[PDB]
Amino acid sequence: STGSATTTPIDSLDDAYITPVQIGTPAQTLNLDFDTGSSDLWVFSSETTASEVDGQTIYTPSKSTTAKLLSGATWSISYGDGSSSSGDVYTDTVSVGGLTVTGQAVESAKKVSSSFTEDSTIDGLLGLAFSTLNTVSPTQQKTFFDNAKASLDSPVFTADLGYHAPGTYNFGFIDTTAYTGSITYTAVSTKQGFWEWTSTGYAVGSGTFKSTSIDGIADTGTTLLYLPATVVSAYWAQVSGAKSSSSVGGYVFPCSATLPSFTFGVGSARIVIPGDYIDFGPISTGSSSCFGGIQSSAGIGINIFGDVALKAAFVVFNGATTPTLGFASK
Ligand SMILES: CC(C)CN(C[C@@H](O)[C@H](Cc1ccccc1)NC(=O)O[C@H]1CO[C@H]2OCC[C@H]21)S(=O)(=O)c1ccc(N)cc1
Numbered sequence: 198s199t200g201s202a203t204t205t206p207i208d209s210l211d212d213a214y215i216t217p218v219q220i221g222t223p224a225q226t227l228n229l230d231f232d233t234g235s236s237d238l239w240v241f242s243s244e245t246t247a248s249e250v251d252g253q254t255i256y257t258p259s260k261s262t263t264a265k266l267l268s269g270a271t272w273s274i275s276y277g278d279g280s281s282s283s284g285d286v287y288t289d290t291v292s293v294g295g296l297t298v299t300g301q302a303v304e305s306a307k308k309v310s311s312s313f314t315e316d317s318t319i320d321g322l323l324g325l326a327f328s329t330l331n332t333v334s335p336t337q338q339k340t341f342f343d344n345a346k347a348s349l350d351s352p353v354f355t356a357d358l359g360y361h362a363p364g365t366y367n368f369g370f371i372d373t374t375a376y377t378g379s380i381t382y383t384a385v386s387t388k389q390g391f392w393e394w395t396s397t398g399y400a401v402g403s404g405t406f407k408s409t410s411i412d413g414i415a416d417t418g419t420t421l422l423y424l425p426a427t428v429v430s431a432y433w434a435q436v437s438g439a440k441s442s443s444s445v446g447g448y449v450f451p452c453s454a455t456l457p458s459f460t461f462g463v464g465s466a467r468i469v470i471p472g473d474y475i476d477f478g479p480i481s482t483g484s485s486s487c488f489g490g491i492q493s494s495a496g497i498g499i500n501i502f503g504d505v506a507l508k509a510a511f512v513v514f515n516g517a518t519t520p521t522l523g524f525a526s527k
């Protein structure tokens with residue numbers, strides 16, 4: 198089997214991407230944030246505290262003839278941005294772009310934190326990291342991809358995110374028209390539960406390539422590119438007027454500035470992020486200062502190849518017995 202679904206930016210700056218997901222019988226369609234850096238599929242629901250719902254579409258398990266409460270199971274998750282959610286667990290039928298999994302664990306939120314409430318465009322998360330990170334207790338549950346994998350034509354999914362435009366998540370096949378050149382594959386460590394890999398280095402603009410190992414995670418759920426402070430300082434030093442602002446929480450730059458590209462290495466191959474992918478718009482409404490899309494990972498504990506990096510590539514998440522990651526230009 199295969200599936201193919203379009204993913205759409207939530208706003209004009211690509212602050213996140215949402216993908217429609219059919220849950221239950223009859224289908225209830227929710228727009229979920231596909232997140233290769235976490236492993237829970239959770240949704241706003243009829244069980245979510247009423248004051249914490251503000252415009253999201255909810256899943257109502259009592260209206261799904263295929264839903265079954267998973268006895269004794271609860272979940273509770275805390276994310277890198279300080280947000281959180283928690284609740285109980287149903288199994289139900291879940292379809293993405295024509296690919297159907299029966300008995301998928303659907304984590305129904307009883308509580309969500311303020312950031313989730315305040316974002317009316319995201320109805321929940323669909324985690325695509327490794328199932329070892331799933332938070333369901335006392336019996337850990339599998340991701341949508343893990344449940345689907347054996348049925349897929351090939352045990353892979355691909356992310357093809359657009360810059361200020363929709364893109365595509367495919368399951369079970371590689372669309373050879375979606376990229377140029379070849380796909381270069383690179384080793385993955387699953388020891389932290391992430392699609393963790395080692396980039397071979399970077400270049401800024403037209404500068405020469407610096408060979409240096411950068412360990413980080415391929416994360417569709419993170420908006421920006423978070424890298425070591427040395428790398429980030431070298432990038433912003435090439436942007437006239439850019440500065441790190443402790444009040445804003447990162448590097449900012451004059452909104453009209455010409456941003457250089459940023460290149461990262463995948464083995465001997467190179468992925469070039471165009472400069473305008475690095476522009477996240479005014480720091481506050483009406484400001485002449487803009488927020489940068491490459492920021493220091495100091496304090497995170499891990500480097501994150503988020504959407505700023507991934508949207509410059511066609512990315513293969515290869516779930517073979519020994520997982521690997523593939524990157525192609527496009
Ligand atoms: C989309 C959000 C709901 C989650 N985010 C991305 C997500 O992939 C993070 C990415 C992530 C990963 C590690 C450290 C920080 C952030 N994963 C994460 O927090 O996973 C949690 C699952 O349980 C815990 O065990 C693993 C980490 C925890 S996020 O971290 O909040 C985030 C979102 C946007 C940006 N620009 C930066 C970070």
Ligand code: NA
Binds near residue numbers: 374375376527
């Ligand atoms: Na394309």
